[PDB]
Amino acid sequence: GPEAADIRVLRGHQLSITCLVVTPDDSAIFSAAKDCSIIKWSVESGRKLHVIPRAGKPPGHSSHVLCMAISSDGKYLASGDRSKLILIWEAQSCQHLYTFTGHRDAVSGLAFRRGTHQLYSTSHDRSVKVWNVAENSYVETLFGHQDAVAALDALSRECCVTAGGRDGTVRVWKIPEESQLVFYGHQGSIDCIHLINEEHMVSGADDGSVALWGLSKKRPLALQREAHGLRGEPGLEQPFWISSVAALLNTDLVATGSHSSCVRLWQCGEGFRQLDLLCDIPLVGFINSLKFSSSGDFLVAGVGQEHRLGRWWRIKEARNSVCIIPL
């Protein structure tokens, strides 16, 4: 059980963190925030390795970055923003390489196909797009979601998964098969998603539910209601909404984040048919992003005083920080 005395709180962002990635070699973290900057941090020292400031016209973002992805070889960083752009960077040097245009609204989810330089994106424009980063090329656009798309993840197969926000679907995009599997589940807005292995994923919803899914089955394999508890009055309590989820690849460990003052670790039961609470990790604020290290030695939380998508709520006791949680 990691406590405050264990969690390194990295300060630098001027506003709420919206997303982050950990480099495959676990040496560095890239974070982005509502300040429109991207910061590269050293995991070992906690110091900044590079800062890409808000945007001669030097490269950078002029509006919020909402999502980021890093390729499995650690070569490319992709960052998607409210300007409808995906910026591509050399992750080693933070040198700008390319800008993908084509989305018609904010870019909301990004993931590289593991073992390749193929990039999948999704957007408030309701589309999923496929790009080849090695060749700075656009490949194709896929449709299905009925509303703005909330999130996207991918692993090694020519496939990606999306959280549909308000359309209440999780969709599985089988690209060469030219097929889309549609799943319906844990109610309200499906706001975050992460693959656990090639055949299973975890999602979080604005009604506080955390669901486990398998690719075969159209309904969740498991569903934990009110996963971060409640606030309010008898008969009218409102559940804490799930703002981030993460899974440690090829294991049974998942993490969830809300604004309930703790990050929760869960263990998936046999066949992913149950979610069991392992521990509460104390951490105040909106848990806007969660990512496990490759080693599983640590978990990284991106924390904001505000929710990653808006200004509706403020937690003044929180700090806009990248938090390294040793496991």
XYZ file of C-alpha atoms in Angstrom:
327
model
C 0.000 0.000 0.000
C 1.772 3.119 -1.298
C 1.170 6.196 0.860
C 1.918 9.936 0.596
C 5.452 9.248 1.872
C 6.060 7.060 -1.214
C 4.447 9.086 -4.005
C 6.697 11.481 -5.905
C 4.756 14.563 -6.977
C 6.323 16.195 -10.036
C 5.499 19.885 -10.444
C 5.823 22.059 -13.547
C 2.507 22.265 -15.371
C 0.622 25.534 -14.862
C -2.788 23.873 -15.342
C -4.535 20.488 -15.035
C -2.831 17.486 -16.652
C -4.983 15.922 -19.396
C -2.972 12.843 -20.400
C 0.407 11.167 -20.103
C 2.471 8.248 -21.385
C 5.426 6.359 -19.976
C 8.204 5.474 -22.420
C 8.472 1.706 -23.104
C 11.882 1.560 -21.366
C 10.335 3.169 -18.211
C 13.006 5.910 -18.177
C 10.771 8.873 -18.988
C 7.208 10.227 -18.791
C 5.534 12.589 -21.263
C 2.686 14.669 -19.844
C 0.374 17.233 -21.409
C -1.922 19.774 -19.757
C -4.492 22.526 -20.259
C -1.480 24.877 -20.413
C -0.988 23.397 -23.946
C 2.546 22.272 -23.104
C 4.144 18.849 -23.167
C 6.734 18.040 -20.497
C 9.188 15.128 -20.661
C 10.238 13.964 -17.169
C 12.994 11.682 -15.907
C 11.483 8.860 -13.857
C 14.723 8.351 -11.899
C 15.438 12.003 -10.962
C 12.014 13.614 -11.305
C 13.651 16.451 -13.229
C 12.442 17.821 -16.572
C 14.251 16.457 -19.630
C 12.478 18.698 -22.147
C 9.615 21.181 -22.299
C 7.557 21.772 -25.455
C 5.895 25.135 -24.756
C 2.470 26.296 -25.919
C 2.496 27.729 -29.457
C 9.545 32.288 -36.687
C 6.801 29.873 -35.625
C 8.241 27.115 -33.397
C 6.306 23.805 -33.301
C 3.762 23.165 -30.552
C 0.113 23.168 -29.549
C -2.094 26.281 -29.532
C -5.001 24.543 -27.738
C -5.379 21.766 -25.118
C -3.691 18.468 -25.816
C -6.323 15.807 -24.956
C -4.449 12.612 -25.799
C -0.988 11.185 -26.430
C 0.593 7.930 -27.606
C 4.127 6.589 -27.859
C 5.265 3.838 -30.227
C 6.439 0.562 -28.697
C 10.067 1.128 -29.798
C 10.012 4.520 -28.049
C 10.703 6.327 -31.331
C 7.586 8.439 -31.922
C 5.357 10.537 -29.701
C 1.914 11.524 -31.023
C -0.128 14.293 -29.388
C -3.729 15.179 -30.284
C -5.395 18.507 -29.550
C -8.449 20.772 -29.674
C -7.086 22.279 -32.926
C -7.972 18.987 -34.711
C -4.265 18.155 -35.079
C -1.993 15.246 -34.304
C 1.610 16.350 -33.831
C 4.362 13.760 -34.287
C 7.643 14.112 -32.417
C 10.968 12.319 -32.201
C 10.578 11.166 -28.570
C 14.335 11.059 -27.905
C 14.978 14.718 -28.847
C 11.442 16.208 -28.783
C 12.028 17.403 -32.339
C 8.808 18.039 -34.270
C 8.530 15.720 -37.292
C 5.027 16.039 -38.758
C 1.480 17.331 -38.281
C -1.452 15.122 -39.326
C -4.520 17.049 -40.492
C -7.838 15.409 -41.355
C -9.925 15.251 -38.221
C -12.805 17.739 -38.206
C -12.989 18.278 -34.438
C -10.787 17.772 -31.348
C -8.582 14.676 -31.310
C -9.577 12.621 -28.276
C -7.773 9.272 -28.388
C -4.490 7.939 -29.759
C -2.691 4.584 -29.751
C 0.079 3.008 -31.803
C -0.259 -0.589 -32.944
C 2.337 -2.421 -30.855
C 5.414 -3.490 -32.863
C 4.671 -1.029 -35.684
C 4.567 2.683 -36.551
C 0.857 2.468 -37.420
C -1.218 5.027 -35.488
C -4.934 4.941 -34.633
C -6.767 8.098 -33.695
C -10.264 9.089 -32.703
C -12.051 12.402 -32.358
C -15.067 14.459 -31.328
C -15.845 14.252 -35.074
C -17.105 10.663 -34.383
C -14.493 8.999 -36.624
C -11.566 6.653 -36.162
C -8.558 7.304 -38.389
C -5.610 5.140 -39.383
C -2.188 6.668 -40.079
C 1.293 5.440 -40.973
C 3.825 7.479 -38.984
C 6.888 5.938 -40.680
C 5.553 7.311 -43.986
C 3.764 10.459 -42.722
C 0.630 9.150 -44.456
C -3.124 8.917 -43.949
C -4.569 5.449 -44.564
C -8.325 5.389 -43.883
C -11.323 6.620 -41.884
C -13.862 4.445 -40.061
C -17.366 5.369 -38.878
C -19.891 3.981 -36.412
C -19.945 6.024 -33.197
C -23.094 8.113 -32.753
C -21.404 10.862 -30.721
C -18.000 12.367 -29.890
C -15.570 9.554 -29.093
C -13.960 9.564 -25.644
C -10.933 7.276 -25.839
C -8.963 4.725 -27.852
C -6.504 1.921 -27.136
C -4.643 -0.691 -29.183
C -2.207 -3.560 -28.777
C -0.364 -5.698 -31.370
C -3.204 -6.903 -33.629
C -4.494 -4.758 -36.516
C -7.331 -3.653 -34.269
C -8.280 -0.881 -31.861
C -10.964 -0.324 -29.239
C -12.915 2.867 -28.492
C -15.019 4.284 -25.669
C -18.065 5.970 -27.157
C -18.793 8.505 -24.421
C -22.512 9.290 -24.724
C -23.423 6.624 -27.298
C -22.950 4.014 -24.533
C -20.891 1.696 -26.686
C -17.455 0.239 -26.634
C -16.440 -0.545 -30.201
C -13.858 -2.972 -31.525
C -12.487 -2.082 -34.940
C -11.235 -5.095 -36.877
C -9.396 -3.271 -39.643
C -8.294 -5.821 -42.294
C -11.501 -7.790 -41.629
C -13.412 -4.551 -42.439
C -15.634 -5.256 -39.433
C -16.721 -3.485 -36.249
C -17.899 -5.301 -33.121
C -20.311 -3.177 -31.073
C -20.680 -3.707 -27.309
C -23.293 -2.208 -24.947
C -22.673 -1.994 -21.207
C -22.202 0.004 -18.013
C -24.569 2.902 -18.254
C -24.069 6.588 -18.865
C -21.096 8.009 -20.702
C -18.224 5.576 -21.350
C -15.326 7.928 -20.771
C -12.102 5.905 -20.532
C -10.745 2.586 -21.763
C -7.596 0.456 -21.626
C -6.729 -2.980 -22.983
C -5.662 -5.638 -20.456
C -4.533 -8.135 -23.098
C -5.297 -8.728 -26.797
C -8.750 -10.112 -25.868
C -9.822 -8.120 -22.780
C -10.309 -4.488 -21.776
C -11.412 -2.288 -18.882
C -13.666 0.794 -19.154
C -14.892 3.544 -16.825
C -18.174 5.445 -16.947
C -19.679 8.659 -15.611
C -22.110 6.679 -13.434
C -19.102 5.394 -11.479
C -19.080 1.910 -12.986
C -15.962 -0.001 -14.022
C -16.474 -2.784 -16.538
C -14.359 -5.685 -17.757
C -14.957 -6.836 -21.333
C -13.938 -9.756 -23.519
C -13.899 -9.607 -27.338
C -16.235 -12.579 -27.771
C -19.047 -11.304 -25.540
C -21.268 -8.267 -26.252
C -22.024 -7.517 -22.570
C -19.398 -6.893 -19.862
C -17.786 -9.939 -18.214
C -17.755 -7.977 -14.943
C -19.211 -4.686 -13.736
C -18.356 -2.928 -10.486
C -20.994 -0.314 -9.672
C -20.040 2.881 -7.786
C -16.378 1.853 -7.952
C -15.177 5.040 -6.246
C -18.115 5.370 -3.871
C -20.750 8.041 -3.384
C -21.454 11.567 -2.226
C -24.770 13.183 -1.312
C -27.950 12.516 0.625
C -29.906 9.311 1.448
C -31.741 8.026 -1.645
C -30.087 10.656 -3.858
C -26.337 9.993 -3.621
C -24.379 10.600 -6.823
C -21.526 8.236 -7.699
C -18.005 9.565 -8.317
C -17.434 9.388 -12.063
C -14.510 7.405 -13.492
C -12.086 9.736 -15.267
C -9.239 7.276 -15.927
C -8.519 3.546 -16.078
C -5.335 1.565 -16.668
C -4.284 -2.071 -16.857
C -0.931 -3.779 -16.466
C -0.473 -5.695 -19.732
C -1.013 -9.486 -19.538
C -1.795 -9.499 -15.817
C -4.903 -9.242 -13.633
C -4.075 -5.778 -12.260
C -6.105 -2.693 -13.108
C -6.137 0.848 -11.729
C -8.999 3.338 -11.609
C -9.125 7.102 -11.055
C -11.868 9.571 -10.221
C -11.867 12.596 -7.903
C -12.698 10.625 -4.744
C -9.244 11.337 -3.168
C -7.801 7.919 -4.000
C -6.550 5.843 -6.887
C -7.895 2.285 -6.625
C -6.077 -0.910 -7.552
C -8.160 -3.934 -8.475
C -7.535 -7.571 -9.199
C -9.460 -9.278 -11.973
C -10.962 -12.634 -11.050
C -10.772 -15.867 -13.027
C -11.962 -15.331 -16.607
C -12.258 -11.594 -15.821
C -15.649 -12.352 -14.240
C -15.098 -10.295 -11.064
C -13.296 -7.150 -9.917
C -11.897 -7.202 -6.399
C -10.516 -4.148 -4.608
C -6.840 -4.507 -3.626
C -6.143 -1.096 -2.083
C -6.804 2.636 -1.973
C -3.846 4.865 -2.787
C -4.333 8.357 -1.294
C -4.221 11.073 -3.971
C -6.313 14.267 -4.053
C -7.723 15.816 -7.242
C -9.001 14.738 -10.631
C -7.133 11.621 -11.722
C -7.122 12.555 -15.375
C -4.666 9.919 -16.565
C -3.299 6.566 -15.363
C -0.501 4.469 -16.864
C 1.453 1.469 -15.578
C 5.188 1.114 -16.160
C 6.263 -1.708 -18.492
C 7.900 -3.421 -15.505
C 4.813 -3.045 -13.313
C 7.133 -1.524 -10.680
C 5.222 1.759 -10.731
C 2.006 3.525 -11.707
C 1.841 7.104 -13.012
C -1.122 9.366 -12.281
C -1.788 12.660 -14.053
C -3.608 14.917 -11.605
C -5.568 18.127 -12.180
C -7.370 20.648 -10.011
C -9.983 20.327 -12.781
C -11.406 17.507 -14.878
C -9.431 17.023 -18.109
C -12.385 18.093 -20.319
C -13.782 21.207 -18.604
C -13.877 23.883 -15.928
C -17.071 22.757 -14.128
C -15.310 21.664 -10.952
C -12.197 22.729 -9.066
C -10.360 20.963 -6.248
C -8.116 23.648 -4.757
C -6.350 21.143 -2.476
C -5.020 19.235 -5.499
C -1.858 20.088 -7.397
C -1.425 19.913 -11.169
C 1.106 17.162 -11.064
C 2.578 14.007 -12.502
C 2.596 11.496 -9.650
C 4.863 8.446 -9.580
C 3.373 5.703 -7.395
C 5.787 2.874 -6.517
C 4.074 -0.538 -6.461
